[PDB]
Swiss-Prot record, chain C:
Glycans are attached at residue 80. Residues 76-96 are annotated as: Fusion peptide 2. Residues 57-78 are annotated as: Fusion peptide 1. Disulfide bonds join 81-92. It comes from the Viruses. Mediates fusion of the virion and cellular membranes by acting as a class I viral fusion protein. Under the current model, the protein has at least three conformational states: pre-fusion native state, pre-hairpin intermediate state, and post-fusion hairpin state. During viral and target cell membrane fusion, the coiled coil regions (heptad repeats) assume a trimer-of-hairpins structure, positioning the fusion peptide in close proximity to the C-terminal region of the ectodomain. This is Spike protein S2. The record marks 56-57 as: Cleavage. It comes from Human coronavirus HKU1 (isolate N2) (HCoV-HKU1). The chain holds residues 845 to 993 of 1351 of the full protein.
Swiss-Prot record, chain D:
Disulfide bonds join 7-143, 138-170, 150-229, 269-279. Attaches the virion to the cell membrane by interacting with host receptor, initiating the infection. This is Spike protein S1. Residues 1-281 form the BetaCoV S1-NTD domain. It comes from Human coronavirus HKU1 (isolate N2) (HCoV-HKU1). It comes from the Viruses. The lineage of its organism: Viruses, Riboviria, Orthornavirae, Pisuviricota, Pisoniviricetes. Glycans are attached at residues 6, 16, 45, 101, 119, 158, 175, 179, 238.
Amino acid sequence: INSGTTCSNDLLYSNTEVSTGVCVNYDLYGITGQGIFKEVSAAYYNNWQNLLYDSNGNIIGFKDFLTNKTYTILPCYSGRVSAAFYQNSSSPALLYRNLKCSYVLNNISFISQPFYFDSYLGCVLNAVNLTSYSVSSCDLRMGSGFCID
Amino acid sequence: PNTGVYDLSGFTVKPVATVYRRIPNLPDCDIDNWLNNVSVPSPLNWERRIFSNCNFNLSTLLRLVHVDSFSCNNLDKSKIFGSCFNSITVDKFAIPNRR
Amino acid sequence: EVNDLLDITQLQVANALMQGVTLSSNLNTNLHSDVDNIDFKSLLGCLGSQCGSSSRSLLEDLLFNKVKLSDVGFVEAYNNCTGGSEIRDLLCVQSFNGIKVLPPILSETQISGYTTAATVAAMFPPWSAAAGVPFSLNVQYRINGLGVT
Amino acid sequence: VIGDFNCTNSFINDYNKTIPRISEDVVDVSLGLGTYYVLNRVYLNTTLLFTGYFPKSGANFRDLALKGSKYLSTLWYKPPFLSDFNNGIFSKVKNTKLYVNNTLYSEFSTIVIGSVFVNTSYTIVVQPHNGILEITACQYTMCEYPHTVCKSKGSIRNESWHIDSSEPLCLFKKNFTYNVSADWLYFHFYQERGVFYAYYADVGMPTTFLFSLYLGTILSHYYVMPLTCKAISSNTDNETLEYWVTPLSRRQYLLNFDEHGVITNAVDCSSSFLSEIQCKTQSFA
Amino acid sequence: LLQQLFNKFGAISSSLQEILSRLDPPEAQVQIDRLINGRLTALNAYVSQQLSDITLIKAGASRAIEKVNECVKSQSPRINFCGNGNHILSLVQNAPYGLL
Amino acid sequence: LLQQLFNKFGAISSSLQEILSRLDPPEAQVQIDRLINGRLTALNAYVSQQLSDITLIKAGASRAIEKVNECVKSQSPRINFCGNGNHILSLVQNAPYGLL
Ligand SMILES: *[C@@H]1O[C@H](CO)[C@@H](O[C@@H]2O[C@H](CO)[C@@H](O[C@H]3O[C@H](CO[C@H]4O[C@H](CO)[C@@H](O)[C@H](O[C@H]5O[C@H](CO)[C@@H](O)[C@H](O)[C@@H]5O)[C@@H]4O)[C@@H](O)[C@H](O[C@H]4O[C@H](CO)[C@@H](O)[C@H](O)[C@@H]4O)[C@@H]3O)[C@H](O)[C@H]2NC(C)=O)[C@H](O)[C@H]1NC(C)=O
Ligand SMILES: *[C@@H]1O[C@H](CO)[C@@H](O[C@@H]2O[C@H](CO)[C@@H](O)[C@H](O)[C@H]2NC(C)=O)[C@H](O)[C@H]1NC(C)=O
Ligand SMILES: *[C@@H]1O[C@H](CO)[C@@H](O[C@@H]2O[C@H](CO)[C@@H](O)[C@H](O)[C@H]2NC(C)=O)[C@H](O)[C@H]1NC(C)=O
Ligand SMILES: *[C@@H]1O[C@H](CO)[C@@H](O[C@@H]2O[C@H](CO)[C@@H](O)[C@H](O)[C@H]2NC(C)=O)[C@H](O)[C@H]1NC(C)=O
Ligand SMILES: *[C@@H]1O[C@H](CO)[C@@H](O[C@@H]2O[C@H](CO)[C@@H](O)[C@H](O)[C@H]2NC(C)=O)[C@H](O)[C@H]1NC(C)=O
Ligand SMILES: *[C@@H]1O[C@H](CO)[C@@H](O)[C@H](O)[C@H]1NC(C)=O
Ligand SMILES: *[C@@H]1O[C@H](CO)[C@@H](O)[C@H](O)[C@H]1NC(C)=O
Ligand SMILES: *[C@@H]1O[C@H](CO)[C@@H](O)[C@H](O)[C@H]1NC(C)=O
Ligand SMILES: *[C@@H]1O[C@H](CO)[C@@H](O)[C@H](O)[C@H]1NC(C)=O
Ligand SMILES: *[C@@H]1O[C@H](CO)[C@@H](O)[C@H](O)[C@H]1NC(C)=O
Ligand SMILES: *[C@@H]1O[C@H](CO)[C@@H](O)[C@H](O)[C@H]1NC(C)=O
Ligand SMILES: *[C@@H]1O[C@H](CO)[C@@H](O)[C@H](O)[C@H]1NC(C)=O
Ligand SMILES: *[C@@H]1O[C@H](CO)[C@@H](O)[C@H](O)[C@H]1NC(C)=O
Ligand SMILES: *[C@@H]1O[C@H](CO)[C@@H](O)[C@H](O)[C@H]1NC(C)=O
Ligand SMILES: *[C@@H]1O[C@H](CO)[C@@H](O)[C@H](O)[C@H]1NC(C)=O
Ligand SMILES: *[C@@H]1O[C@H](CO)[C@@H](O)[C@H](O)[C@H]1NC(C)=O
Ligand SMILES: *[C@@H]1O[C@H](CO)[C@@H](O)[C@H](O)[C@H]1NC(C)=O
């Protein structure tokens, strides 16, 4: 026992769990990572290739040799928030840069925020849309000619 | 704190599950292609085969042959499912009813 | 600190283009694009009282179309990162490992307006950027000062 | 000498001592021949500056094919023929063809790669079986004169490179299929970081991945195993066994992948000055 | 800078997940320390290069301010400052990361 | 910079008295070398930042010298150099690390 080759292959499943659209771990044929899968048809694999690469060295697609089905892999979202905080307040204002507010209220934060809008810079939470007004000096400069007052 | 704009880290994504694939080296054993053999030997001249250097599991086995019991001894029934042994030596024969 | 210095030099260049220029409230660049049979249409964005200040000139458009990753190209590059939208770009893999590019505090349409006013300040009453005299008179006096009668 | 466990004792004719030849063909890697696809990966419309174990541009071969009629020298098991596996070998193997009632029989020699070739350490044997190529990485118990036999119209001797009828510890066992009517077969074998890598192709092209095998040790020797057949020579239908090998080296190549993923061009980055310019700018022009 | 996340720097791998899933935590720190030191070395080199580029950018920004003030907004009795001499006048335009 | 003397940098301690009174001279070298490397990296980073700050200080010193020469000791036919343009005159005064 516990030294050799006649191994029991069960406590190491290999199911059809290629669940697209979400972020998941992967251990594909030796290579480890996390990513987002998406089903596709591919025309370039031969009978000895199961991973797709680029010249930088990133793994960008694969082919499950259990189902003969091809998929593409995307990186999972990582980022920061920009908090515009005025003194003696109780909570800052939040900018998720380059993100739609549907993506923010669905996939990032489920916490109660009654105020949000989709600005040119991203998604603004805890602030009113008042771009018709204008100001000549601002402490909280957000970029591209916008400001928080 | 003072007035300012700060770059605060948010927790962003957590991975849901695992995927796995390894395209195995050795060939399966097919114990159940031997345990469902036609010519069953009698308790005088029982057979024995030594299934070694292959891959196996238990669930396809014990549902592909019509089990009525599976005890163990010096073992725990879930310690099969993980480990890697060195050989397996299945010895079968038929049963006379009153003995 | 480097990004603070960049903001300071941006505000200084924007300050020098507007330091002491006075314009007429009855100007309209749709009507007054030239003087003295010298054509200034390709140098001027828009201005007046009925235009809408989001406009560059012809030369500025001809230069910004040949350069992709401007301040606006970076924003619309990073907007496409949720999903890749083809499969992949280098900037989304860079931003998901912590390397982003921020927009500057003044948009480039604002600096387009500041160069529009530096252009129009030399062509009309009160000729602030021309030392008080009209434009072709100024050219005449400048050529006169080289040894021309 | 190969293995200590003695198997045979007859027909130990000892006087013949022929040497491996030297070919009249430099290996030319301009059209992919000499290179391989990167394990199990795909690359589309790109140039890849890849560092791996390749042959050297402008080098020559050594034929290691040995055909006995009935006799077996002990100088056929000597460091004239038992060579070393430093980094690897690129191999060009001739596919001999025999005909019995106009039926095609392919044949060439097998190959063993190991360290000390006993039943306490792992050796790798690649063996043809007439259109089927069986690879076994195990703990064999090697014979004193390991040799093989042909199977179409066989020899007088019995194929005996091991007598180990116990199914020993194998780390790898697999089967592959190739063209029986092919002219040559190309093979890459190398090792790095305690892992063995193997590649093959049958049509002249870059070689395709066979398998990787994690061992942990360092192989040090290899041997082309001598064959013994009935009638192959020039009095017959003019068959001749060949097995050419060239060593491998850790060097840098530039590969060109088209939009379907076929290696169209390769450049050895130290052949000339233009190749150094081509590889440091990562472009063919 | 992004290609520095694929060097090993003398470790067994460049992946943190491979090291934390194949070694034991007294022996994993010896490998993660090499990756940490190599990546912090890379970031220090990038930061020094940015600190040296900003000084050239500031010198160019100050001369552009000066040409705005004394060739466009007014005209100056310098010779060979704007243009080449026989210079008459000068206009300005907005450009990506600068001024034409 | 003074707070870099309390970092461990991978060693067992940040004190040298603790490493030298708890380990053996073959074993304490492995721990003293890590402190040496971390502290010399800290010093190299500080020296790079000082060498880059000196160039901005010298650019400010040159513009202050020039404003003394052509707005204070005399008056120049430049427009929009000192003041705003409609500039009449300029005085100078001494300031901590500079000039008002
Ligand atoms: C893993 O590999 C190892 C190899 O490294 C395997 O080990 C080998 O196992 C062989 C058994 O199959 C064994 O072969 C011979 O061993 C017998 C024991 O020999 C001793 O006892 C004899 C008592 O009669 C004695 O005479 C003999 O002395 C002889 O040899 C020495 C040199 O070793 C001379 O100096 C003497 O003068 C004398 O000549 C030994 O002391 C031996 O009896 C067997 O020979 C008889 O049987 C043969 C076949 O029937 C027959 O041909 C022969 O004439 C004899 O009648 C037998 O051949 C190897 O010695 C042994 N090698 C080592 C290094 O241990 C191991 O089995 C393998 N493991 C597995 C699981 O496969
Ligand atoms: C138990 O092991 C059996 C081994 O047969 C597994 O079934 C095999 O799955 C692979 C993957 O497609 C097929 O190539 C084989 O043909 C299957 N075997 C047979 C007999 O058809 C099975 O998936 C395992 N199940 C569990 C729960 O471990
Ligand atoms: C996926 O495609 C492969 C082809 O590469 C299929 O493998 C073939 O399977 C049939 C019957 O199982 C064999 O007769 C062929 O010889 C196989 N071809 C090769 C190249 O091995 C495989 O069956 C396919 N799998 C699925 C689920 O469709
Ligand atoms: C059941 O076991 C017997 C072994 O007793 C297998 O019998 C073999 O059958 C082949 C048929 O071609 C014969 O050539 C062998 O000689 C037989 N073996 C022996 C030892 O006699 C039989 O194949 C097994 N059944 C299955 C389905 O595998
Ligand atoms: C690979 O193919 C060979 C045949 O080319 C198989 O060897 C046969 O195995 C069966 C059962 O063990 C024997 O009855 C035959 O006599 C063998 N033939 C020869 C020529 O040796 C081998 O089993 C196959 N192995 C795998 C892993 O597929
Ligand atoms: C506002 O902040 C200042 C901090 O300087 C604090 O002293 C003061 O009490 C605050 N005012 C209120 C109403 O909390
Ligand atoms: C975001 O959440 C929705 C459900 O609220 C889900 O359908 C979608 O897959 C999620 N997107 C990502 C990228 O996880
Ligand atoms: C924000 O306000 C402006 C003007 O008030 C309006 O045009 C724009 O559509 C608004 N956007 C959102 C997301 O509310
Ligand atoms: C002279 O003035 C008229 C109207 O004031 C104008 O249309 C014309 O272009 C001017 N010509 C010159 C040479 O200045
Ligand atoms: C962003 O995605 C849209 C939709 O696919 C596309 O039309 C646009 O060209 C993309 N922009 C960039 C900069 O990639
Ligand atoms: C090898 O074994 C055979 C019989 O097994 C025996 O006749 C022969 O003498 C042996 N040779 C040596 C060198 O032991
Ligand atoms: C035997 O060896 C000699 C010299 O080593 C060689 O000339 C001869 O060809 C060999 N015999 C055969 C049959 O090849
Ligand atoms: C070939 O590679 C070039 C390199 O950018 C790419 O533009 C082109 O689309 C590729 N060809 C195909 C058919 O995709
Ligand atoms: C060829 O034919 C002869 C007689 O017709 C027969 O003895 C021999 O076995 C055949 N060879 C093969 C490979 O079938
Ligand atoms: C080869 O084996 C056969 C039977 O397996 C036997 O008759 C023959 O004598 C053997 N030949 C030699 C040289 O051992
Ligand atoms: C390789 O095999 C294919 C089909 O199996 C055949 O058409 C082709 O002729 C073979 N190659 C050679 C060189 O005979
Ligand atoms: C094979 O070689 C012999 C000896 O030179 C020759 O007579 C025969 O023609 C050759 N076979 C063919 C098919 O040319």
